Amino acid sequence: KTCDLVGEKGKESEKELALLKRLTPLFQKSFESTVGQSPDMYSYVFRVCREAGQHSSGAGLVQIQKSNGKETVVGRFNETQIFQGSNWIMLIYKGGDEYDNHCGREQRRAVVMISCNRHTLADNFNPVSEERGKVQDCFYLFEMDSSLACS
Amino acid sequence: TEEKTCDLVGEKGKESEKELALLKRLTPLFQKSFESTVGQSPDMYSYVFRVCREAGQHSSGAGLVQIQKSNGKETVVGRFNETQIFQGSNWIMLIYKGGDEYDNHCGREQRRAVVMISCNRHTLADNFNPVSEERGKVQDCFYLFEMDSSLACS
């Protein structure tokens, strides 16, 4: 139902658990951004610890192909990692759908950099880039502003 | 013979051109060295960090070392021959894996250094600072540091 962290119950990081708690105000929200040019125009939908897709795939972030409405899971919230810096929070969703001919067929992953902005609880969700040219450790990068990242 | 430098994942010819271009962007920082003394006895540490160059004193290929102030013992936090680097709009994250293994934490996995470099148009590099150490997970633990650099802007 919500984000799952590495480690069995009772062995998860208290630091990560506390950060999930801090981001709770964003759980019911949904963020979207359409980018790219044909034939690769995509609509990215992102949610914090909740289903972002339409197929109960457990997606935390999905990539919708505008051409046919096909949905590709970029990252699943059942594989969440979250940590903070002085004025930012990085949220990572691993376990997305596998690449077909890139990154050794590695499962996609979403990396979201949340920057401190005292004037908004959440705003400016924006796809930044996709690294698909490595033998491993590929990822989609996104950015967003949130006062919850301020310390 | 050149000084040993950062090595990215993948054999030569298969590395990310994006990562290669970012390393090139930080070239001006290679010759520098950053230090930060933190903590309280008996755990007072001196963290020494360098970008793509040896930060230790034992030619073990450390990109970031943690020196035990009490006895001078050097613990490798991350080795630059296992570098990952990527950028956002106004920041660059540099990761050094392959540090010395934990003895009783994180499933005894190798230590890892994560450095968040934020844009600061006023200086080429400043305020290297240890932020925290996550040693309470079954895996994927890491030491986090921050630093300012105009090279991380735009």
Swiss-Prot record, chain A:
Q: Which cysteines are joined by disulfide bonds?
A: 3-49, 103-138, 116-150
Please name the GO terms that the record assigns under molecular function.
protein domain specific binding; retromer complex binding
What is the top-level taxon of the source organism?
A: Eukaryota
Q: Which residues lie on this side of the membrane: Lumenal?
A: 1-151
Domain named MRH is located at: 1-151
State the membrane topology.
Single-pass type I membrane protein
The processes (GO biological process) annotated in the record are: lysosomal transport; protein targeting to lysosome; secretion of lysosomal enzymes
Q: One GO CC annotation, please? A: trans-Golgi network
Enumerate the UniProt keywords alphabetically: Disulfide bond, Glycoprotein, Lysosome, Membrane, Phosphoprotein, Receptor, Signal, Transmembrane, Transmembrane helix, Transport
| Glycan attachment sites | 28, 54, 65, 78, 84
Q: Where in the cell is it found?
A: Lysosome membrane
- What is the role of this chain? Transport of phosphorylated lysosomal enzymes from the Golgi complex and the cell surface to lysosomes. Lysosomal enzymes bearing phosphomannosyl residues bind specifically to mannose-6-phosphate receptors in the Golgi apparatus and the resulting receptor-ligand complex is transported to an acidic prelyosomal compartment where the low pH mediates the dissociation of the complex.
Q: What is known of its domains?
A: The extracellular domain is homologous to the repeating units (of approximately 147 AA) of the cation-independent mannose 6-phosphate receptor.
| Miscellaneous note of the record | This receptor has optimal binding in the presence of divalent cations.
Q: What assembly does the database describe for this protein? A: Homodimer. Interacts with GGA1, GGA2 and GGA3.
Q: Report the protein name in the record.
A: Cation-dependent mannose-6-phosphate receptor
Native organism: Bos taurus
